[PDB]
């Protein structure tokens, strides 16, 4: 087999391999997500295709379970492996425990994989950063972000991909108790969070929402334009 260390230290202590991994995270498309009041909403920009691609495989907003969904920004390659093996854990947790999955329980097992891939022999750190968001028991939503390094955080409003820091500046300034008040204001905030990094993109914004007991629902392009129609 192939056995050697990949990521090694540096004279300044920083990790060459891991920093280049987070660099590829920023090179990907811009994805955003927020934790609403009674709901959760995800969104990601779409590079504009010209009259070709099908939106079934292109959709970057997936669902790990009925309780928890996710989005990703980075290399599309490593994203599909995490989505598959996380859904396995969701069914394995229900197989082991009759109680449903917990957003914090599933999130840690995800980022824990990327930590294993970093320190394992011959493996590689992923170039993806995923937003794990879902509903806990009693209906309390939770939004967590992963890291190629294996850490995970908690975020009320979050933005990933290209210009993630630029949108985060719009977040911290315009995020207040006025934000994510209602299902409408939560979605309009996600749209406005994608309006800074958009250059003549227009309709390219696609949205998704999960409402209480119901599972992730994809807003139709016309339903998206309904909330996009109000800008000024």
């Amino acid at each position: 087999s192939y056995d050697r260390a990949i990521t090694v230290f540096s004279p300044d202590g920083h990790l060459f391999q891991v920093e280049y991994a987070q660099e590829a995270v920023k090179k990907g498309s811009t994805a955003v997500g927020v934790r609403g009041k009674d709901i959760v909403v995800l969104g990601v920009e779409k590079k504009s295709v010209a009259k070709l691609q099908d939106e079934r495989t292109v959709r970057k907003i997936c669902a790990l379970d009925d309780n928890v969904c996710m989005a990703f920004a980075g290399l599309t390659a490593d994203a599909r492996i995490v989505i598959n093996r996380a859904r396995v854990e969701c069914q394995s947790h229900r197989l082991t425990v009759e109680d449903p999955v917990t957003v914090e329980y599933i999130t840690r097992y995800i980022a824990s994989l990327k930590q294993r891939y970093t320190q394992s022999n011959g493996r590689r750190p992923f170039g993806i950063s995923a937003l794990i968001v879902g509903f806990d028991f009693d209906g309390t939503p939770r939004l967590y972000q992963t890291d190629p390094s294996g850490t995970y955080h908690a975020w009320k409003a979050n933005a990933i991909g290209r210009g993630a820091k630029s949108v985060r500046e719009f977040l911290e300034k315009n995020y207040t108790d006025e934000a994510i008040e209602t299902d409408d204001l939560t979605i309009k905030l996600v749209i406005k969070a994608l309006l800074e990094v958009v250059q003549s993109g227009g309709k390219n914004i696609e949205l998704a929402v999960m409402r209480r007991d119901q599972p992730l629902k994809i807003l139709n392009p016309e339903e998206i334009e309904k909330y996009v129609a109000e800008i000024e």
């Binding site: 004279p11 300044d12 920083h14 920093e19 987070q22 390094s149 820091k165």
Partner: protein, 208 residues
């Protein structure tokens, strides 16, 4: 060292002044200055086809050279001094944009050094252009003096006629060298500017 919000900020203002000039030069001064040399080379005085008429006949006091060629030297000399000034302003600006020295993420620093080394070719050539012009004065002045010393050899009169053409030939070369000094330099700056002015940094890792 400590912090001096006044005296140390005067250095930052000196940098912000050069940063303000650099953007003003690229968007205004350079595009106009490069075009001014185009019409300068298209001037019919530099397009002269027959150089047999510009040969200065020597009387062998009644000693003089071609005044039209000297005027052509007097027209090119300011343009040589104008690019040297603009060459030093960019060279200083490139040095003040150098970030701190670190082992990692040093690729962008080498990119700034690669563009910086492209200026060294211009520092030497521009000084050699004006020095060569001043050398023509001594060559043509001594050729007439040697002809005035021994009134025998007629090749010194042909040597002056050659140096009369040798100047004009190198003028048209230098005019193209001066125009290429602005034009190529203006393209190199635009080729490395926009997102590579700050190649790395302001990105980090979300954690540590």
């Amino acid at each position: 060292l400590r912090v001096q919000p006044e005296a140390q900020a005067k250095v930052d203002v000196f940098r912000e002044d050069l940063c303000t000039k650099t953007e003003n030069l690229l968007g205004s001064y350079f595009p106009k200055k490069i075009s001014e040399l185009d019409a300068f080379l298209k001037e019919p005085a530099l397009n002269e086809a027959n150089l047999s008429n510009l040969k200065a006949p020597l009387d062998i006091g009644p000693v003089n050279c071609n005044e039209k060629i000297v005027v052509l030297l007097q027209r090119l000399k300011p343009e040589i001094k104008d690019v040297i000034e603009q060459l030093n302003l960019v060279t200083t600006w490139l040095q003040l944009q150098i970030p701190r020295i670190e082992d990692g993420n040093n690729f962008g620093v080498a990119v700034q050094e690669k563009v910086f080394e492209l200026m060294t070719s211009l520092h030497t050539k521009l000084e050699g252009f004006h020095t060569q012009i001043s050398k023509y004065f001594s060559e043509r002045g001594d050729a007439v003096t040697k002809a005035a010393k021994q009134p025998h050899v007629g090749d010194y009169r042909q040597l002056v006629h050659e140096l009369d053409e040798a100047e004009y030939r190198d003028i048209r070369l230098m005019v193209m060298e001066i125009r290429n000094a602005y034009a190529v330099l203006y393209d190199i700056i635009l080729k490395n500017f926009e997102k590579l002015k700050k190649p790395r940094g302001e990105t980090k890792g979300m954690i540590y």
